[PDB]
Amino acid sequence: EANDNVKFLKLVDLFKPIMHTLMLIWKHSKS
């Protein structure tokens, strides 16, 4: 199970689209 979640886990004004990535990670991981 540790192996599984390791495989899952792989100026800020410019980097708010990265936060979409974060929501998508929470979107993708928990789905």
């Binding site: 689209p17 979409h20 990535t21 998508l24 993708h28």
Partner: peptide, 17 residues
């Protein structure tokens, strides 16, 4: 006085299947 980012991140999550 960002559609392609969505699709590509879906692609990378599917690479980690």
């Amino acid at each position: 006085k960002t559609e392609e980012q969505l699709k590509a991140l879906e692609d990378e999550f599917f690479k980690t299947t």
